[PDB]
Nucleic acid binder design. Structure first.
Lengths: 290, 215, 49, 491, 239, 221
RNA sequence: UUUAAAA
RNA sequence: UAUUAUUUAUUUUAAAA
């Protein structure tokens, strides 16, 4: 019930790496071309980078805040993997290493690192708050699971819109989405994950390994940056021991990637906003005088 | 759906709004899924008890090489007077220590016997405010009935009785004790506890053979 | 009471009445049943239950 | 889906008897073709939302055919639709300095409902017949089609009226409106009407703000004002005659003596003057006799300070008050309403629908006959009215604050209230109030003294050794400094 | 406690230490001789950790047998009384434990010569009795010392240290109060080398500030290796 | 009109994507593959049906959705020519296209059409063809409508899911695979929509046959 | 709880 | 009967002639 790699295939891919050759034709520091597609409802995002395809789905509901932080909203994320992305995955295996690590990294990047404005999700302190949920669906597994999932969640949160709320003394009314247009969430910074795969025949490091390269891997490193030159999160455990010089090279190379991907999400959101707001030029209330 | 809305609270009834003989009824053989069935009901004073016991065995365990059999007893809540799951499993381990001394285990190699007791209704009609001690004797009599109906060999009958939280299970017409259970109660009292339970044991020892010889 | 009537505003209330779509089954509730088919097994809820 | 499908291509039919036109709009038959009237518009320069338009023609019997024409907004904003609900919630249009919040989409306010010149436009006309004394002989209300000949500004209208080389029919019509407005205002001031001043200034933009400009008045400003007042009075009487239980009207309560109590104590024990409180005419005539020989602006200062003592005007429906309570203290009129601005105010939208029910153009909506719904509407538009005034006064006060730090200068002003540890100065150059705390006013606030009876505060000025006494109503000179690590001082 | 000074101009922290001073490090070996093959009672500051190594032994079921190396299983048990407030078990709190356990397995499976012990399993049972910041680094030190007690062959030491960055001042061995007020980096340094086997950054840190934090992190971790090494010298010479 | 694609996923034997109104369902099929010990059938093929919701985790709602989707595909597959083998059919609901708390017929209908197309792309032996449509009747004017919108469901008296089996060029209705009805209706309304549905499914397979032929024909020679 | 007019 | 065995293989000494 697992993937079988022949000895010749393992030797060919590794020797190709020793000759600066990747089967797909990318460089060692080249990220796969990401493609963001937005659905009908808000918070519906499908990410395609190479043969890897992931689909995200944002939702929210009124919930009880944590008693330790009565002024913050909750953030939930589930990254279960179905046999759809490959028969090597068992359906119902929620506690798998890939599922746990993917959830924890996006959770640290979004919730813990302040990417999502949880204080803006506060309705009534200590009682009512927004619980923004992010569902991730692994459609086709060709490596880069957490890299694609982090782009899907961050694109979904910036594309998602929550119902409106009016403060009337001690009363609070939630407008239906059919009456008033929903309000977008608060997104401070945009964290993007970049995973590095290491090999040894003098070590070789490739960015965003495919499924075949991921299986012949000797060590994995995940970094998360934003356009503000901040290191949102780093996860490296085991594998080939590395030093501070190799990491900083990974972070500087990843910053060149996350900066371009950030500008793409901002541009692709702007294009999607205009597509669904054709007659928005007539409905403007706040207008300039003369 | 299930569970329902989390914001809902269960109903609360206030106590300030408006205001010898232990009956027994026995039946056996009525569940087609299992081998031996049983249904015991008892209503004394303001406390009515009705529970159902089913025996699924003997089941041949694949790859097992045990010399004797293994008994598995499991208590399960019903619909009224729900007890905590920890105390239910405590009575289960106490019951398994009883029937492992009664059921002929050597007559079932490489196999196991699974017991299922359902406390379907444990009514209590006290006027104004462990309660599980009043059901242990009724559960022992129910398992022995379903074990006998399932064609399982039982070395002598097994019954018990309550004496203010003191539950004692006897065998060989009270000659030897097979189980001891006592919650709350008082001190020094012991001779009267073993006496009140022994006469209650003989009351159940022959009443079980009554319905087992008829039908 | 999360109704817009409590806002005491005629404009918002009229906008709510126009944009509100009919939801016939929204006026009805249901029971939350718990099925327990005893088949001599242990574990979580069966697909039948 | 509530706006017309034609959009900018919407045009008024050329033939009101056209079968295709009346098939889509059956109410077109009850419309008076007035496109032969030489109607003009007078609005501030660079105006895109034209609510009113006037015309004047001399009848053969010596009288004049004066008629104001108001945008037929209720022809597009129908009740029970989301367009009505959106306008009712906004209540009015808020006019800030840089931005402006509209009550209705720009498709209506800027193009279709606005009385644009050279284009046929629907309107709600109010035709009068005045004599040489500006007395109404008969009033008639009708929905009409008009074509504005010109759209002058206030400065452009003042030029053509004072121009001597133009004597066409439209120009002569603008001469009559000027001679009839001064006669209407004459009898209004004799009836007891007030004459208050308001610090209304507007700043110019390209940074962005550079300087503040006080707006000067013209004789054409009062020309349109008297006929807008006359239009609202006539419609108020008409809509109350048809629906005495739910008529959308506006009232103004009489000011209690408590409001003018503190103001008279200041003028008596510092200027030796007072304000009469017997009647509205006694109050207006007392302000005219309340003037300082050295400060010509001091007379306008008392008129401004007395405006804050005035009661707040109120929208209401006629079924909740007896007729004597309909009185409007400020205008000294028996009954008044708002009608000549349905693009801005929502109160006028309800007046148009009620006026259309009195004429028989279309039946009045049942929501405008409900006392419960009308009571809620009146409370909302009252709240949205003060909020729109507080928003404008704050936008003018903030954007002028950027002119204080980005343009250091010295400006003259008058003090309006003295405190134990501060003075409030009013500047006519900017029309805003300024608080000068005692800590920022002297080097030693512990040696100061406050006299409550004479309304003075004695302190040792900064960079000065001689104490200065600052009474109320003093023509002081203030400066502007930037101490941040905006502020006004006292020269 | 209350509103405190994190790093005073006098170079003193809220608990009295300085920027490069570690908490008290009291380690112990062979604390459970009749219950495991390797024992280490780690007491780093207020952190109290019991690490038990059971192996290499035959697997209970052949479903977890490798014919070329041993299997490494790390079980981290965080007691209900490890903090002040007795924490109740949360469904979300179970995910953070699995991430720590997996990070520990992947860390020591590369340093422990599993090839020498084929067809065997090595169970690592950990009990955290009290935590006060820097718990991830202290878990590493307990595993390293417990594996050595069990005679398990390794390539070198694995030292765990936690570094915090406050404004522009890095701080060594962060406690619970300091972690609540700054970003924290945990490191897994291999022996006296400058090589990292673990690097967890769970809070935002500027990129230009990360280079220096790692240098001071691997340096202070060498000091942790000395404290662990000396404890093994004293325990071997006295026995 | 409906949209559908084939062979979209790489690491599975057969995939598809079915779209109707706003309901989008991506389905994948992998088989025959090695079954688990608790799955193998001695004589025929075993099926693993999995449907996952667009939001939240898989609840008991999708469990009855699996059981209905299973009852449709099981007679539609020649299970006996794959003894001791497994087929994994996984449906992923991208957008529900309906109120999930109230209705689930628009998702069941799309999962049937997506699973059938994915089974065609995979190469599983199918006994015939299949089509599925949702049906509803409006409260005020008791009118039968095929493929109702989300707003029409909230104004309907009863909802219906009709799944038919087509043979011989898509003209002969061999059997009625699934007819799931909930709401208020009598015997006259049943055969009225059943007759109406048989001709709307008949033009669906005619359009489905065109969809799959436009994709499989360029593959073959 | 700032009168009136045009914005 | 370890030069023996495990079949969807728990074998962990298959080397010499």
């Amino acid at each position: 019930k697992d993937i079988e790699i022949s000895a010749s295939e393992s030797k060919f891919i590794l020797e190709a790496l020793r000759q600066n050759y990747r089967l797909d034709g990318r460089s060692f520091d080249q990220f796969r071309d990401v493609e963001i597609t937005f659905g009908k409802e808000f918070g519906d995002v499908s990410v395609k980078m190479g043969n890897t395809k992931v689909h995200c789905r944002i939702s929210c509901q009124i919930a009880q805040p944590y008693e330790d932080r009565p002024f913050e909203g909750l953030f939930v994320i589930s990254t279960e993997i179905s046999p759809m992305a490959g028969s090597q995955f068992e359906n119902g295996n929620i506690t798998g290493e890939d599922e746990v690590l993917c959830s924890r990294i996006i959770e640290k990047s979004v919730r813990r690192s302040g990417a999502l404005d949880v204080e803006g999700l506060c309705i009534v302190a200590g009682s009512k708050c927004w619980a923004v949920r992010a569902d991730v669906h692994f459609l086709d597994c060709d490596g880069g699971f957490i890299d694609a999932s982090c782009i899907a969640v961050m694109a979904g949160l910036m594309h998602f819109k929550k119902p409106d709320i009016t403060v009337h003394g001690e009363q609070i009314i939630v407008h239906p989405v059919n009456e008033r247009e929903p309000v977008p969430l608060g997104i401070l910074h945009i964290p993007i994950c970049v995973t590095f795969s290491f090999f040894n025949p003098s070590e070789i490091s490739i960015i965003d390994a495919t499924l075949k390269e991921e299986l012949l891997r000797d060590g994995v490193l995940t970094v998360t940056l934003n356009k503000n030159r901040e290191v949102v999160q780093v996860s490296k455990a085991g594998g080939l021991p590395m030093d501070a010089l190799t990491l900083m090279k990974c972070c500087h190379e990843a910053y060149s990637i996350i900066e371009k991907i950030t500008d793409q999400i901002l541009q692709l959101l702007k294009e999607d906003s205009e597509k669904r707001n054709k007659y928005a030029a007539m409905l403007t209330s706040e207008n300039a005088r003369e | 759906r299930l569970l329902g809305p989390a914001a809902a609270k269960p109903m609360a009834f206030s106590n300030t709004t408006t205001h010898s003989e232990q009956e027994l009824s026995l039946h056996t053989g009525f569940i087609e899924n299992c081998n031996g069935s049983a249904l015991v009901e008892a209503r004394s004073l303001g406390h009515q008890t009705s529970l159902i016991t089913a025996v699924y065995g003997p089941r041949s365990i694949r790859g097992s090489f045990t010399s004797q059999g293994t008994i598995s007893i499991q208590l399960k809540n019903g619909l009224l007077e729900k007890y905590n799951t920890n105390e239910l499993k405590e009575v289960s381990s106490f019951l398994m220590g009883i029937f492992n001394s009664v059921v002929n285990l050597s007559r079932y190699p490489k196999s196991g016997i699974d017991i299922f007791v359902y406390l379907t209704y444990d009514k209590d009609l006290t006027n104004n405010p462990s309660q599980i001690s009043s059901l242990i004797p009724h559960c022992i009599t129910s398992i022995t009935l379903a074990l006998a109906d399932a064609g399982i060999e039982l070395v002598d009958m097994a019954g018990a009785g309550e004496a203010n939280g003191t539950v004692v299970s006897f065998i060989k017409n009270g000659e030897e004790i097979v189980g001891f259970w006592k919650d709350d109660g008082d001190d020094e009292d012991l001779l009267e506890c073993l006496d009140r339970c022994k006469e209650q044991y003989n009351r159940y020892r022959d009443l079980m053979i009554s319905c087992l010889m008829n039908q | 009471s999360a109704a817009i009537k409590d806002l005491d505003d005629f404009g918002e209330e009229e906008l709510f009445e126009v944009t509100k779509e009919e939801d016939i089954i929204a006026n009805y509730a249901s029971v939350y049943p718990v099925v327990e088919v005893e088949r001599g097994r242990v574990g979580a809820c069966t697909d039948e239950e | 889906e509530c706006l017309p499908a034609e959009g900018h291509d919407w045009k008024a039919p050329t033939k009101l008897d056209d079968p295709e036109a009346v098939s889509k709009d059956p109410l077109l038959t009850k419309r008076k073709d007035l496109r032969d009237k030489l109607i003009c518009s007078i609005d501030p320069p660079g105006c895109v939302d034209i609510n009113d338009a006037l015309h004047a023609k001399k009848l053969p019997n010596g009288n004049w055919e004066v008629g104001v024409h108001i945008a037929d907004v209720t022809h597009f904003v129908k009740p029970g639709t989301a367009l009505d609900a959106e306008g009712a919630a906004r209540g009015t249009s808020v006019y800030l300095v840089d931005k402006r919040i509209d009550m209705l989409p720009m498709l209506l306010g800027t193009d279709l409902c606005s009385l644009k010149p050279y284009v046929d436009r629907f309107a709600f006309s109010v035709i009068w017949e005045l004599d040489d004394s500006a007395n109404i002989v008969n009033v008639n209300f009708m929905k009409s089609v008009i074509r504005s000949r010109e759209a002058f500004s206030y400065e452009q209208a003042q030029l053509r009226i004072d121009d001597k080389t133009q004597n066409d029919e439209l120009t002569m019509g603008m001469r009559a409106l000027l001679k009839l407005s001064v006669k209407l205002k004459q009898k209004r001031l004799e009836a007891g009407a007030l004459n208050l001043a308001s610090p209304e200034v507007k700043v110019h933009m390209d940074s962005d703000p550079n300087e503040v400009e006080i707006k000067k008045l013209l004789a054409t400003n009062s020309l349109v004002e008297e006929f807008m007042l006359l239009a609202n009075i006539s419609v108020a009487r008409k809509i109350y005659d048809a629906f005495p239980q739910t008529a959308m009207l506006r009232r103004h309560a009489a000011p209690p003596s408590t409001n003018f109590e503190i103001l008279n104590e200041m003028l008596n024990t510092r200027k030796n003057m007072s304000i009469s409180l017997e009647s509205s005419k006694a109050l207006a005539d007392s302000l005219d006799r309340c003037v300082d020989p050295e400060d010509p602006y001091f007379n306008t200062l008392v008129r401004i300070m007395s405006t804050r003592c005035m009661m707040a005007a109120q929208y209401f429906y006629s079924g909740a008050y007896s007729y004597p309570d309909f009185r409007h203290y400020g205008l000294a009129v028996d009954i008044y309403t708002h009608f000549t601005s349905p693009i801005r105010r929502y109160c006028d939208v309800v007046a148009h629908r009620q006026l259309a029910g009195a004429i028989g153009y279309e039946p009045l909506s049942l929501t405008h006959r409900d006392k419960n719904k009308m009571d809620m509407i009146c409370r909302n538009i009252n709240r949205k009215h003060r909020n729109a005034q507080f928003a404008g006064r704050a936008s003018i006060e903030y954007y002028v604050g950027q002119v204080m730090r980005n343009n250091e200068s010295t400006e003259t002003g008058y003090v309006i209230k003295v405190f134990n540890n501060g003075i409030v100065v009013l500047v006519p150059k900017f029309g805003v109030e300024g608080l000068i705390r005692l800590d920022n006013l002297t080097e030693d606030p512990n040696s100061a003294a406050f006299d409550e009876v004479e309304y003075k505060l004695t302190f040792v000025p900064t960079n000065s050794d001689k104490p200065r006494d600052v009474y109320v109503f003093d023509k002081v000179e203030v400066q502007v400094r930037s101490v941040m690590d905006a502020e006004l001082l006292l020269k | 406690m209350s509103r405190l000074e994190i790093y005073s101009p006098e170079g003193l922290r809220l608990d009295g230490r300085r920027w490069n001073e570690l908490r008290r490090f009291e380690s112990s070996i062979n604390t459970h001789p009749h219950a495991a093959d390797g024992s280490s009672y780690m007491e780093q500051g207020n952190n109290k950790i019991i690490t038990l190594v059971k192996g290499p032994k035959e697997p209970r079921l052949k479903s977890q047998m490798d014919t070329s190396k041993a299997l490494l299983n790390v079980s981290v048990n965080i007691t209900k009384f490890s903090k002040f407030e007795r924490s109740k078990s949360s469904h979300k709190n179970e995910r953070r434990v699995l991430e720590i356990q997996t990070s520990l397995v992947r860390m020591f499976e590369k340093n422990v010569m599993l090839n020498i012990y084929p067809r065997t399993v090595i169970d690592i049972e950990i009990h955290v009795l009290e935590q006060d910041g820097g718990i991830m680094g202290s878990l590493i030190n307990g595993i390293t010392l417990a594996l050595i007690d069990a005679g398990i062959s390794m390539f070198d030491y694995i030292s765990g240290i936690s570094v915090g960055l406050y404004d522009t001042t890095p701080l060594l061995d962060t406690n619970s109060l300091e972690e609540n007020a700054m970003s924290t980096v945990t490191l897994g340094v291999v022996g006296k080398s400058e090589k990292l086997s673990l690097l967890l950054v769970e809070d935002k840190i500027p990129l230009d500030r990360l280079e220096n934090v790692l240098a001071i992190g691997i340096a202070g971790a060498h000091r942790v290796r000395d404290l662990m090494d000396e404890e093994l010298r004293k325990h071997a010479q006295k026995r | 009109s409906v949209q559908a694609e084939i062979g979209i996923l790489d690491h599975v034997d057969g995939s598809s994507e079915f779209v109707s109104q706003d309901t989008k369902v991506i389905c994948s099929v992998t088989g025959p593959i090695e079954p688990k010990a608790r799955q193998e059938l001695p004589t025929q093929l075993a099926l693993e049906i999995i449907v996952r919701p667009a939001k939240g985790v898989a609840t008991t709602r999708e469990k009855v959705l699996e059981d209905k989707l299973r009852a449709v595909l099981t007679p539609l597959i020649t299970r006996h020519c794959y003894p001791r083998q497994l087929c994994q059919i996984t449906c992923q609901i991208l957008e529900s296209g309906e109120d999930e708390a109230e209705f689930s017929l628009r998702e069941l209908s799309c999962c049937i059409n997506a699973a059938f197309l994915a089974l065609v792309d995979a190469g599983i032996a199918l006994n015939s063809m299949c089509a599925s449509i949702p049906i509803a009747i409006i409260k005020d004017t008791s009118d039968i409508i095929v493929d109702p919108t989300a707003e029409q469901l909230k104004i309907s008296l009863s909802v219906h899911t009709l799944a038919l089996e087509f043979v011989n060029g898509g003209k002969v209705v061999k059997n009625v695979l699934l007819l799931d009805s909930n709401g208020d209706f009598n015997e006259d309304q049943l055969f009225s929509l059943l007759e109406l549905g048989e001709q709307k499914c008949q033009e669906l397979v005619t359009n489905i046959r065109r969809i799959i032929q436009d994709n499989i024909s360029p593959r073959l020679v």
